[PDB]
Amino acid sequence: PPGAFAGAGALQRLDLRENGLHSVHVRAFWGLGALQLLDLSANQLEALAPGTFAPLRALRNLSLAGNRLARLEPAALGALPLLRSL
Amino acid sequence: PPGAFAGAGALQRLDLRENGLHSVHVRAFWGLGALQLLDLSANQLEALAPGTFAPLRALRNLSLAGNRLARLEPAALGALPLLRSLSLQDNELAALAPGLLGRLPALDALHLRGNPWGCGCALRPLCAWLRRHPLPASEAETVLCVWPGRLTLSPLTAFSDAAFSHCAQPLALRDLAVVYTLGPASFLVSLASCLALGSGLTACRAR
Amino acid sequence: VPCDSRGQRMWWAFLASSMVTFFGGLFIILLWRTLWMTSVKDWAGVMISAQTLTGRVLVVLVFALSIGALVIYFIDSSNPIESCQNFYKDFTLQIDMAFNVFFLLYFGLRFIAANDKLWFWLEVNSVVDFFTVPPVFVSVYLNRSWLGLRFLRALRLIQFSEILQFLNILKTSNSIKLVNLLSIFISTWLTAAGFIHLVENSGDPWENFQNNQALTYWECVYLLMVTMSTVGYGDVYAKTTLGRLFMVFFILGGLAMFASYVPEIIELIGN
Amino acid sequence: VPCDSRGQRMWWAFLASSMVTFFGGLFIILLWRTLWMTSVKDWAGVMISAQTLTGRVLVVLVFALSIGALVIYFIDSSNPIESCQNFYKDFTLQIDMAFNVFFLLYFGLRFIAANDKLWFWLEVNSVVDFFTVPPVFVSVYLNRSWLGLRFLRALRLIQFSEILQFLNILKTSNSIKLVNLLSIFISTWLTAAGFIHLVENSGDPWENFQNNQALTYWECVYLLMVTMSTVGYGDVYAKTTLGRLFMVFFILGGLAMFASYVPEIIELIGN
Ligand SMILES: CC(C)CCC[C@@H](C)[C@H]1CC[C@H]2[C@@H]3CC=C4C[C@@H](O)CC[C@]4(C)[C@H]3CC[C@]12C
Ligand SMILES: CC(C)CCC[C@@H](C)[C@H]1CC[C@H]2[C@@H]3CC=C4C[C@@H](O)CC[C@]4(C)[C@H]3CC[C@]12C
Ligand SMILES: *[C@@H]1O[C@H](CO)[C@@H](O)[C@H](O)[C@H]1NC(C)=O
Ligand SMILES: *[C@@H]1O[C@H](CO)[C@@H](O)[C@H](O)[C@H]1NC(C)=O
Ligand SMILES: [K+]
Ligand SMILES: [K+]
Ligand SMILES: [K+]
Numbered sequence: 106p107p108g109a110f111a112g113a114g115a116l117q118r119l120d121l122r123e124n125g126l127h128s129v130h131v132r133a134f135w136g137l138g139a140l141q142l143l144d145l146s147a148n149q150l151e152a153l154a155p156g157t158f159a160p161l162r163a164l165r166n167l168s169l170a171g172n173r174l175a176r177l178e179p180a181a182l183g184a185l186p187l188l189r190s191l
Numbered sequence: 192p193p194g195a196f197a198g199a200g201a202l203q204r205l206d207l208r209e210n211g212l213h214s215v216h217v218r219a220f221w222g223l224g225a226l227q228l229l230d231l232s233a234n235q236l237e238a239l240a241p242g243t244f245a246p247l248r249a250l251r252n253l254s255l256a257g258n259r260l261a262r263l264e265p266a267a268l269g270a271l272p273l274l275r276s277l278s279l280q281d282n283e284l285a286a287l288a289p290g291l292l293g294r295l296p297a298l299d300a301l302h303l304r305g306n307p308w309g310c311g312c313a314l315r316p317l318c319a320w321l322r323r324h325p326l327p328a329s330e331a332e333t334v335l336c337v338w339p340g341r342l343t344l345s346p347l348t349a350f351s352d353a354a355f356s357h358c359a360q361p362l363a364l365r366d367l368a369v370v371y372t373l374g375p376a377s378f379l380v381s382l383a384s385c386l387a388l389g390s391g392l393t394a395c396r397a398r
Numbered sequence: 399v400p401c402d403s404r405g406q407r408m409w410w411a412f413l414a415s416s417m418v419t420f421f422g423g424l425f426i427i428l429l430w431r432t433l434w435m436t437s438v439k440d441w442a443g444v445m446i447s448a449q450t451l452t453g454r455v456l457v458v459l460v461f462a463l464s465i466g467a468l469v470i471y472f473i474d475s476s477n478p479i480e481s482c483q484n485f486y487k488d489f490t491l492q493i494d495m496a497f498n499v500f501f502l503l504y505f506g507l508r509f510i511a512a513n514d515k516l517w518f519w520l521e522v523n524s525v526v527d528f529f530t531v532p533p534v535f536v537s538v539y540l541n542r543s544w545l546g547l548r549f550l551r552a553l554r555l556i557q558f559s560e561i562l563q564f565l566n567i568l569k570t571s572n573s574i575k576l577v578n579l580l581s582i583f584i585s586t587w588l589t590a591a592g593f594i595h596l597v598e599n600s601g602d603p604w605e606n607f608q609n610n611q612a613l614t615y616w617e618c619v620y621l622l623m624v625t626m627s628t629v630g631y632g633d634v635y636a637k638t639t640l641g642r643l644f645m646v647f648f649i650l651g652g653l654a655m656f657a658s659y660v661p662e663i664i665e666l667i668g669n
Numbered sequence: 670v671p672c673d674s675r676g677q678r679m680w681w682a683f684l685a686s687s688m689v690t691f692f693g694g695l696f697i698i699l700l701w702r703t704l705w706m707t708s709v710k711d712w713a714g715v716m717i718s719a720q721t722l723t724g725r726v727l728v729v730l731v732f733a734l735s736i737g738a739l740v741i742y743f744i745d746s747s748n749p750i751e752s753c754q755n756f757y758k759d760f761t762l763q764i765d766m767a768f769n770v771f772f773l774l775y776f777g778l779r780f781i782a783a784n785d786k787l788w789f790w791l792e793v794n795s796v797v798d799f800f801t802v803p804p805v806f807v808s809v810y811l812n813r814s815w816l817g818l819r820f821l822r823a824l825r826l827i828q829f830s831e832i833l834q835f836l837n838i839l840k841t842s843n844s845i846k847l848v849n850l851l852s853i854f855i856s857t858w859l860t861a862a863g864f865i866h867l868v869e870n871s872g873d874p875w876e877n878f879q880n881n882q883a884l885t886y887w888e889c890v891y892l893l894m895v896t897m898s899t900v901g902y903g904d905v906y907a908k909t910t911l912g913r914l915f916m917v918f919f920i921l922g923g924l925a926m927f928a929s930y931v932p933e934i935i936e937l938i939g940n
Contacts, residue, residue: 106281106305106306106307107307107335107337107343108335108343109305111332111333111335112332112333130307132337132342132343135342135343135344310401311401311403312401312403312405313403350399351399353399354399354401356399357399357400357401357403357482358403358405359405359406359408359482359540359542361406362411366540367411369539370411370414370415370536370539370540371414371415371418373415373532373535373536373539374415374416374418374419374528374531374532374535374536375418375419375422375423377502377531377532377535378419378423378502378505378506381502381503381505381506382506382509382510384503384506385442385503385506385507385509385510386438386510389438389441389442389510390434390438392441393434393437393438393441625900628898628899628900629900630895630900630901630902630903631902632901632902632903632904635902635904639887642891646890646891646894646895649894649895649898649900650894653898657934657938658938661938
């Protein structure tokens with residue numbers, strides 16, 4: 106849901122694997138840009154809405170392994186200067 | 192099935208969660224109105240037929256968390272005077288029909304956390320209910336809404352009567368009379384103006 | 399606080415604002431029949447006469463403003479039918495308001511120069527004024543907007559050939575007749591497409607407008623062209639009951655009009 | 670205890686109740702041909718003559734009752750085709766019963782005033798009486814109801830122009846011919862739509878009525894209008910075998926009738 110992790114503005118690590126995610130709404134990480142590690146592996150994600158990772162700014166390593174993604178839109182990823190691994 | 196719990200006319204508590212319910216037939220609680228607690232959480236319910244909760248009369252707290260409901264029809268809930276608490280958290284509800292909360296007197300406890308609420312004129316009755324019944328501060332912080340076209344940073348409880356001022360209330364007799372009389376009055380004004388201009392020009396020419 | 403919503407439909411107020419003008423004033427004229435004026439009547443008649451320069455420039459001006467209103471409707475057809483807006487914020491509504499008050503002044507000037515008021519009241523120009531001008535006043539009063547019957551100004555395309563005639567562009571009768579036929583066909587095509595688009599995107603009233611079909615204006619133009627040529631692909635069609643009734647009536651009227659206009663087509667073909 | 674169900678189809682009884690009237694009495698007339706009457710024949714002839722007042726008011730009455738029966742059929746077409754009902758409980762069936770017994774009395778009065786019984790027996794009014802009047806008696810006897818061939822009363826609309834002629838509403842021959850053509854076209858359109866609706870909603874008999882399509886009467890009217898203009902959208906069409914056969918026959922008959930009626934259309938257009 107949008108603003109699912111509301112209240113955790115100082116969150117740094119977030120791991121979601123083996124959960125079978127299939128639909129993530131846009132702007133669901135409102136205020137979660139502080140995180141540095143984001144694991145969204147082992148799911149059934151197919152398409153990513155543009156601007157989903159836009160609130161994220163301090164993210165460093167991102168994982169999208171074991172999913173059903175076919176086309177990765179550049180607008181969805183945006184510009185993340187602090188990213189180091191993908 | 193219809194009359195699934197037949198024979199339990201004196202039932203008071205009924206809990207159904209983590210069962211993955213996907214289809215509940217109408218009038219399936221025939222004679223189950225005596226219950227006070229009803230848990231239908233953690234299921235895959237999408238639509239509710241009208242009159243499903245109509246046989247229920249003594250129900251007090253109702254839970255519909257973790258479901259796939261999108262639109263909640265007022266006819267399905269009906270009028271339950273003895274209800275006190277209701278939960279719709281972790282659902283896919285976008286808006287609530289106006290007058291749904293006014294059908295029942297007591298709605299002291301309400302949980303709407305996690306629903307993708309699209310703030311708008313429709314939500315204004317809910318905001319007014321928030322003004323009448325303030326939520327807890329933590330719950331107010333958690334419950335938010337989606338603002339179309341930009342970020343969803345706007346809290347649900349932050350709205351005031353200024354947002355309601357955009358909504359057009361049903362027009363009274365004054366506005367109805369004005370919108371009925373705008374046409375003919377404007378046409379008569381135009382005719383009178385043209386006639387006066389013609390008469391004045393004729394008077395100036397004849398001089 | 400800033401938000402836009404449809405809320406409750408207010409189309410009936412806009413329609414009644416024209417009905418209680420047209421029918422009520424028709425009844426007033428009838429009752430008056432049951433129960434310096436010559437000088438001002440002659441002044442208004444010579445004011446709008448096609449012989450003088452003033453009448454020529456004024457009919458050119460009203461044709462140009464009708465073209466502008468049609469363009470405004472074409473632009474606004476890509477929006478929800480009923481929507482709230484601020485009159486002071488947007489100036490396109492101000493342009494439409496100026497156009498419509500000019501139309502109202504022209505209608506008053508015509509009404510003064512009328513030997514028979516009742517037969518003037520049943521003209522197509524009078525009825526398009528009735529079904530166009532009060533809605534914009536109601537919209538600016540209620541601070542809302544409805545698409546409505548604003549495509550009917552396309553019915554003023556019929557005078558287009560006349561607009562050429564006194565600008566020394568058409569001399570022979572055959573070219574004038576051809577341009578008149580083309581303008582009539584184009585105008586009726588556009589207004590039929592306008593009604594089809596309105597009745598399709600609006601939805602059925604008695605079914606709480608749940609039968610609305612997302613049809614653009616140009617898609618309805620394509621549908622009318624396909625229908626009138628008796629092709630009928632079936633890719634796009636009217637799904638509402640009132641839309642289907644209008645399609646049946648349009649088919650019958652178009653067939654009758656074409657059968658009536660065959661001899662003029664033959665005369666244009668000639669020998 | 671109170672319940673309604675279709676049960677077994679009883680359409681064949683209603684159809685046979687008209688067939689064993691029509692064909693059997695035709696055979697009786699033929700066999701009689703192989704093997705104060707003048708006074709009563711003259712009395713019946715002057716009773717139904719269009720010159721006298723009685724004939725005029727009586728044909729106006731039967732036209733009005735035919736209009737009422739058509740309206741009753743239009744109302745009842747929004748129901749299941751075969752259904753059980755109580756004759757005493759519902760009074761609309763009583764109204765239809767009164768209309769049909771009046772039709773039967775008129776048919777008897779016409780049959781007395783017939784110089785040639787066999788050629789009277791093959792008239793369209795006689796056959797619509799045969800296929801309309803016995804079914805209501807069978808329905809009230811069996812305490813059931815079947816939709817049947819109750820739209821055929823629309824075939825009396827052909828007399829509509831005559832209804833105007835002796836009420837001093839039409840004088841010239843051109844207007845009478847135009848009204849006659851319009852009434853003929855409307856009546857055949859309505860009855861073709863009635864057959865299409867019946868054969869589509871009833872379903873194929875040899876396939877246990879599993880091919881029924883939920884088509885309303887007005888949807889079938891729209892389908893007939895689309896077909897007769899050679900547009901053919903394909904949004905709605907006949908899916909049953911008998912429905913498709915009827916559509917082919919209707920297409921051929923409509924094309925032949927239009928080709929035959931072209932010269933009258935040209936005469937109405939004139940020079
Ligand atoms: C010839 C003109 C000037 C007068 C004829 C009246 C016509 C144009 C009127 C009468 C009934 C009207 C319709 C009645 C109901 C609705 C539903 C609502 O969503 C607005 C549009 C719509 C679909 C209207 C469109 C305009 C309409 C068809
Ligand atoms: C011209 C008229 C008077 C006589 C011609 C007879 C026609 C109308 C008869 C003969 C065969 C009949 C069909 C035979 C079988 C069925 C299946 C059943 O569900 C009733 C309707 C239906 C589909 C009948 C409709 C009427 C029908 C087509
Ligand atoms: C990126 O961070 C993740 C999170 O734990 C870690 O497992 C991974 O090794 C890191 N990648 C690199 C290249 O350091
Ligand atoms: C409503 O009843 C349920 C059932 O036990 C209970 O868990 C819940 O706390 C009650 N709600 C309130 C607000 O007391
Ligand atoms: K064709
Ligand atoms: K086709
Ligand atoms: K075709």
